[PDB]
Structures are given as structure tokens and as C-alpha cells.
Amino acid sequence: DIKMTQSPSSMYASLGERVTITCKASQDINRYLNWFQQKPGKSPKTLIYRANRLLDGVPSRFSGSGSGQDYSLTISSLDYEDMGIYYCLQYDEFPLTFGDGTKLELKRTVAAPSVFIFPPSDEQLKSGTASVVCLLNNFYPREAKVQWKVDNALQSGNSQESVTEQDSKDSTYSLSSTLTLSKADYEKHKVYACEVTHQGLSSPVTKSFNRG
Amino acid sequence: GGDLVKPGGSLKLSCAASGFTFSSYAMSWVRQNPEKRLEWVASISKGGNTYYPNSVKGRFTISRDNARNILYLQMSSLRSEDTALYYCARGWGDYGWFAYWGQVTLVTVSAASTKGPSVFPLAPSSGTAALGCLVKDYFPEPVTVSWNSGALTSGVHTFPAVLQSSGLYSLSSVVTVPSSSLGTQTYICNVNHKPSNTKVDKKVEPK
């Protein structure tokens, strides 16, 4: 299988900025390369064929280049409608193979998250399970580290997190993290804490509560 | 919400053509898995020659009806790893196989039974407060959430669901509001899980 590697995985860019993203094949693919664009919640749309030709209707601010193993897609002047995920694909040989995609997002100023922690409800505790939830609200950029500590012991393997898409009006993200324990375990400890490290904060922010 | 199949089971997808001459094009199936990777599934030339990746060879069959203008995907021995959005696509020549993208279909392969969610309050802590609802243990996707029947939209964030190890989904919805209004205002989250015909309302208030 011809491996397609895209770089970078994501990047922030400003309106009007010149943007270039890259795709590398594990071998020569003779310019048999498509580029696709996918907006959140939408079907992909095909922009480029043969590495450098635009499909009918594709805006001229788009262009492609490269040959052999090394290719690129350039947007000469970024518009708001251009945010989304960009994928490459080779059709030189079977099997047809995609790159993992490059995500283009809108650049803005740093914004530190507001952090909230929520204990489990009494109603949930009657089911034998306890969920503790940590909210990071309206921050930028997306990268953040969230740690759970129970009576100050770092937790691992018992949490899941999820993140919103970039907000259409302030370009921030929000993140939810859920710590899940049995009722028995939850009742066996006192201090529950969520600790957040982010570029916009000058020290980690910890929100906590005491069971009871 | 979409087709549901038990592991090992069978399914037939169909894609009816409109707005082009179906018999002129190579037709393909492509899927997008929960981690948003795209993967080629099958192709068939205008004359009926088929092409497959090894991951589905022997399990899936692509076929076409050039008289009724319909594309088919017959799936056998389905695996939980086949869970995805499935797209129909058409192409030809140097455009490639995926020049234009068609009708999508969600396919979920899981042993889980359809189940409505439990809804628990995320209670505002003892000038801005956050509150919400945890929508837990439902199957399949999706659920919808609104606040105060749609009257409250500002500052609302509803997160993507996560798949738990139990095979059931979980998600939270939150909103930020003035602390001042915690006394005078009533905040209710409205949950709808159409696949199980379940509607739940939860009033979220300071403990």
C-alpha cells in the first residue's frame, strides 16, 4: 500500500493569509493525486485532480503543485469559507489510499479557559456508578492538558474527553472531560479535583470538591 | 438513526442516481470512520468490472443496475470496525474515482440493543455560573438537546458523544449564565432520543 502522509496535522491561519499544506507518498505516484475539502457536518468536495488541475467551479485562489513523491496545496488568500479538513489521495495504484488529513482553523488571540467541576448527582448514585465532570469553557488555542486527581492520586484509564468545533462567532473551543467510577470507589475517597494546563494560564488551574 | 447490524451480520446499501447519466461513470463506495479517516471501500467500472481493498475482499460485493440507474453495496460478515458513514461517489478518467460525492448512509455494527438515555443534572456550584445535563448510556446515536425549549441558545455547548466500553454512548450539554439569575430563573434541558422514542426533561438547579 502506498502510504500518504500529510503535514501538518492542523494549523491556525488568518483571513487573507497565504497557506500551504503538504502531502508525501511512500513512492512515486506520477501526479495521480486528488485533493478534497470537507467542512464540518458536510460531504467532501473534490478540488484538485492530477496534482494541479482544478475541477470546474473551484475558486482560483486554490492551486496544487508537486511531482514524484512530494506535493502541496496552496490557498493564495484564505477566506472564511475555507476552514475545514483537507485530504489527499493517490490513484496511481490499487489500493486507493488517503492521507489522514490536515485541518485548517481560524487564528485569533490566546484565551484562557474558565474551568468548572461537577459532582455526580444523587440520582445517578442510586445506579451504582458515579460520573465526575470537568468543563473547560471558551478557550484558544485547542491544545490543553487535563488531569484527574482523587485524594491527590493521578488517575489514568478511567476518563474520556470531548471537544467542540471552533465557535463560529468567537473562534474558541470548549472541552468536556468525564471521570467514571463505581459508587463503591467514589464513596471511598474525599477530594475530587480537575487540573488544567493551558497556554493562556500562568499556572495550572485546579477546581475541586469534597465528597459530602 | 441509520442502519444497525449485529457483528457478523449482513446489509445491502443502495444509491439511486439523479442528475447525471449513470451508465457513463465508474462508481465507488467510500467510508468515514468515527476518527474522521476516509477509506476506499469498493469501485465498479461502467462495464461492471470490480475493484476492492483486501480489508473487505470476500465480504462485500459492489454491483450496478445500468437500466434502473442504481448502485449497490452488499455487505457480509460485518465487523464493529466497519462502523462508519458510507458515501456513494462517481468519477472517470483523470478526474479520478471520487470526482463527485453522493448520498451518505450511517452504518453501526454493534451488539448493543436500542436504549434510551438517563439524564442527570450538572449542578451549578455553590459572576458567571455553568450548569448542564449529563446524557448517559444510550444507543444508537443521536440525541438532541435544547435548553428551555429552545428559548435559551446563547452560551450553550453540546459536546460530541463518546462511546463507552459498555458499548453505550454518553454526552454532556452545558450553558453559562449570570450567577445573579440562579435564584430567579428556571433552567431545563430537553433531551430527545428518536431511535428509542424517548423524551426527557430535567430541571437543573443549585443543590
Binding site: 490499487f94 486507493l96 | 447525471f20 451508465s23 457513463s24 461513470y25 465508474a26 475493484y51 478518467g93
Partner: peptide, 13 residues
């Protein structure tokens, strides 16, 4: 007006 019969993509093997 009606789309003619079109070549299969050139992908090899």
C-alpha cells in the same frame, strides 16, 4: 447534452 460514455480511471494493478 447527454453525457457520453467515459474512460475508466487509469489506476494500475
Amino acid at each position: 447534452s447527454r453525457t457520453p460514455s467515459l474512460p475508466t480511471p487509469p489506476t494500475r494493478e
